[PDB]
Every structure is written in C-alpha cells, then in structure tokens.
Write an enzyme that holds these catalytic residues in place. Structure first.
Site, short mmCIF file in Angstrom:
data_model
loop_
_atom_site.label_atom_id
_atom_site.label_comp_id
_atom_site.label_asym_id
_atom_site.label_seq_id
_atom_site.Cartn_x
_atom_site.Cartn_y
_atom_site.Cartn_z
N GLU A 80 -7.17 0.52 -4.22
CA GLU A 80 -7.16 0.40 -2.78
C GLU A 80 -8.46 -0.17 -2.22
OE1 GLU A 80 -5.85 4.36 -1.39
OE2 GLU A 80 -4.01 4.11 -2.56
N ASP B 246 -12.92 4.81 3.83
CA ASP B 246 -11.48 4.91 4.02
C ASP B 246 -11.01 6.31 4.41
OD1 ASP B 246 -8.75 4.90 3.78
OD2 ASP B 246 -8.70 3.83 1.86
N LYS C 273 2.50 11.52 -3.56
CA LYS C 273 1.33 10.87 -4.17
C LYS C 273 0.33 11.86 -4.78
CE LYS C 273 -1.95 7.09 -3.18
NZ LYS C 273 -2.24 6.14 -2.08
N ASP D 6 0.90 -1.14 0.00
CA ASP D 6 0.00 0.00 0.00
C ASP D 6 0.96 1.21 0.00
OD1 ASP D 6 -1.71 2.12 0.66
OD2 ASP D 6 -2.19 1.34 2.65
#
Ligand code: ATP
Ligand code: CL
Ligand code: CL
Ligand code: K
Ligand code: K
Ligand code: MG
EC number: 3.6.4.10
Length: 378
Positions: A172, A196, A68, A7
């Site tokens: 994800e 999430d 990211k 991840d």
C-alpha cells in the site's frame, strides 16, 4: 486489458484504471468512489458493499467486516484471539484456520477470510466492468507492508476466487508513492514517508527509492487506531448530550447507537471542510428527535489525544530508519482520516512546515498507484 488497480481496504475498497495516461477512480452503483469492505447474509440474499453496510445495525451477527484482520492468519494467532472478542459475528476454527460463521437462508455457513474478501473483490471487479463496458480480468491488488507471505498469498487467492488474474501483490505505501510519481528515476535515492490513517488502522512507512526500486526502511503505527475511533469519541459525546437533555440513556439500544454513529461519521467528514456540522436524527429514541450540532473545535478537542498520538509512530519510524526528519524528501497522505485539518497541521508542524502531498484523495491514493502499476505490468 484493461488491467485495474484495487485497494482491498480494511474498511473501504477502491478500484482505479489507467487509460489515456490518466487514472480514473471508478464510482460504484451508488456513485461512491470507495466501497465498504462489508458482506452480509440474510434469510434471502447476500449483500455486498454499500448494500451490506446499510443494514449492519439490523443484522449484526450475519454482517461480516474486518476480514482483512483474519486473512492469512492461523486461528491460534494472538491477534485473532484478541480481535474475535470484539466482533458480533462468529469466528470458528477449521483445522487451525479461522472461518467466519453466519446464517444464510436459514442455514449455517462458514467462509474462509479469502472467500469473504473475494466477494468484496468481485464487487470491485463488477464496478470496473460497468464503467469500462468490458470484462475485467487482470489486476494489481495491494496489502499492508507488514503482511507476511501467508497474508499475501491469501489476498492473492481472494482475487483468484473472484475471477481476477492477480498480476502482482504490492505494498500500500509503495502504491501511494507511485500515485505521486515518486517511482521515477531522478539520479539519486529519495526518502519518502507515507502517513496512512484510515478507518481502522494507522500506518507510517518510510521508503527509500532509487532507480525505480523500493526499499521499506521502516514501518510503525497502530492497527487499532483509525477514523472509527474518532467516530466513537463523537458518539459518546452525543449519548451524554442526549442523556442530559432527555434524561434517557440510549447506549443499550443498538439501532439508536448505529444511527447516531452514522450521523457522527457524516458530520465528521463535513468538519474537514467546514467549521460546524449539524446532526439531525428523527425519532432517535422513543420517538424523540435529536437535532444538534458540533463545531470543528469541539471535534478536535474530543479527539486531541488520539490526533497528537499519531506523531509517536512518525518519530519511531524515523528513528528505526536512522533518518532525521530533515532527510525526508516527500510526505504522502493516505487514508480518509488524513483529510482532517488538525491531523494535517500536527504533521506539518512536526515537519517544520514542509508541504504535504495531498492532491490525490487520500482514500484513493493506494488504488490510484495500483492502477498505474497494473498498466505498467500490462
Ligand atoms: N472528509 C473526511 N474527513 C474525515 N474523515 C474522513 C473523510 N472522508 C473519509 N473519512 C474517514 O476515512 C476512513 C476511511 O478511510 P479509507 O477509505 O482510507 O479506509 P481503509 O484504508 O479501508 O481503512 P483501514 O485503515 O481500516 O484499512 C473512515 O473512518 C471515514 O470516516
Ligand atoms: Cl455498487
Ligand atoms: Cl496543533
Ligand atoms: K481503503
Ligand atoms: K491504514
Ligand atoms: Mg487504507
């Protein structure tokens, strides 16, 4: 072989490996099951992970994070132009592509986002190698469901640069569903909602799964809502408290604010399992110790609006998926922030008491599912 699941998180990364029918989430050199997605450059070395995040306060312009948010994007992308205003490190334009610029050993250097992320992946690869006692090459790496082809490509490239053979880039939320075995065929479609909430982003995804095949029905959320915002609320609260007690404002002292933020983040984690937490900082400002505490009730009040607001994206995702809340077969918690009791209460209440899938540490569920998938593809 063995192949691993990684991840590559906006704030923390995690690596797991499936062996003997079980996923092992691998602890790093400091014994931490997740590792900061940070890289730092100094007059003498390059630091990655825990080592990098531990010196961020003292080296702000040369400590890189949030790669990211740049990966796979163009320099002129509105998101990049907006995000740049908030980072302490420099982002430059190289032929239309963003690069982070830092000083290393007294010289100016620039790196593409995928090179920065490759450093984080190299660290995760080595973490897995130390545990396995064998070279690790194959890996499944995850990305947000909303990532486009360029962002997926740049993420895969980060893996390749780190020496990994990226078997597949998977979403994800899909990885989280796989961790709970929701990919198994039960002879009928199933609707799964992934809630999430991590360190910097909030993602709600509704998946429809049938015959082992995943369909992303809808996604919602906020790319600027996460645990860091709850820490900010606590920091402001304590700056005000210190000002009242000592008639001094620490707001402009970067190191003081950093040490306070670190103590607040730690206190926040404690509040997920206890109703009170102590904050004890020696010589916080001008030699003055700051020993105080905070209750779970106060922490929840300081963040009440932000916690309750997580339900709007849930309602929107349901609306966009053309599903009533009663049609969701499973709710899966992902992201470290979902360990907060008040957030679990809000979501469970919204779902009229439906139980939540939360047995797998939420901050590890993505890597856990990636590891399962990596073994399947191996
Ligand atoms: N026990 C806990 N209680 C509350 N918050 C926690 C707990 N453990 C971790 N967190 C928070 O979870 C966040 C990290 O979550 P996670 O590791 O899933 O991040 P991430 O996926 O990299 O985040 P992003 O959404 O920025 O990509 C941090 O804000 C951290 O403080
Ligand atoms: Cl480490
Ligand atoms: Cl409530
Ligand atoms: K993560
Ligand atoms: K997230
Ligand atoms: Mg995450």
């Amino acid at each position: 072989g063995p192949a691993v699941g990684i991840d590559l998180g906006g704030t923390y990364s995690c690596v797991g490996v499936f062996q003997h029918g079980k996923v092992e989430i691998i602890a790093n050199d400091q014994g931490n099951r997740t590792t900061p997605s940070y890289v730092a450059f100094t007059d003498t070395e390059r630091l990655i992970g825990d080592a990098a995040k531990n010196q961020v306060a003292m080296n702000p312009t040369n400590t890189v994070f949030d790669a990211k948010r740049l990966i796979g994007r163009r320099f002129d992308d509105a998101v990049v132009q907006s995000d740049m205003k908030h980072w302490p490190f420099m982002v430059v334009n190289d032929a239309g592509r963003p690069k982070v610029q830092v000083e290393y050993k007294g010289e100016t250097k620039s790196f593409y986002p995928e090179e920065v992320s490759s450093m984080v992946l190299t660290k995760m690869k080595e973490i897995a190698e130390a545990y396995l006692g064998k070279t690790v090459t194959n890996a499944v790496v995850t990305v947000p469901a909303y990532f486009n082809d360029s962002q997926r490509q740049a993420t895969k490239d980060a893996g390749t640069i780190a020496g990994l053979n990226v078997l597949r880039i998977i979403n994800e939320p899909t990885a989280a569903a796989i961790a709970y075995g929701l990919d198994k065929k039960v002879g009928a479609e199933r609707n799964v909602l992934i809630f999430d909430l991590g360190g910097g982003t909030f993602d709600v995804s509704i998946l429809t799964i049938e015959d082992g095949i995943f369909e992303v029905k809808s996604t919602a959320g906020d790319t600027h809502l996460g645990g860091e915002d709850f820490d900010n609320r606590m920091v402001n609260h304590f700056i005000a408290e210190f000002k009242r007690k000592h008639k001094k404002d620490i707001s402009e002292n970067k190191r003081a604010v950093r040490r306070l933020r670190t103590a607040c983040e730690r206190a926040k984690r404690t509040l997920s399992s206890s109703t009170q937490a102590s904050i004890e900082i020696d010589s916080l400002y001008e030699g003055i110790d700051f020993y105080t505490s905070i209750t779970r009730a106060r922490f929840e009040e300081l963040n009440a609006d932000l916690f309750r607001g997580t339900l709007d994206p849930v309602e929107k995702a349901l609306r966009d998926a053309k599903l009533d809340k009663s049609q969701i077969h499973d709710i899966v918690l992902v992201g470290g922030s979902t360990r907060i009791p008040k957030i679990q209460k809000l979501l469970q209440d919204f779902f009229n008491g439906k139980e939540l899938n939360k047995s797998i540490n939420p901050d590890e569920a993505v890597a856990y599912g990636a590891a399962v998938q990596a073994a399947i593809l191996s």
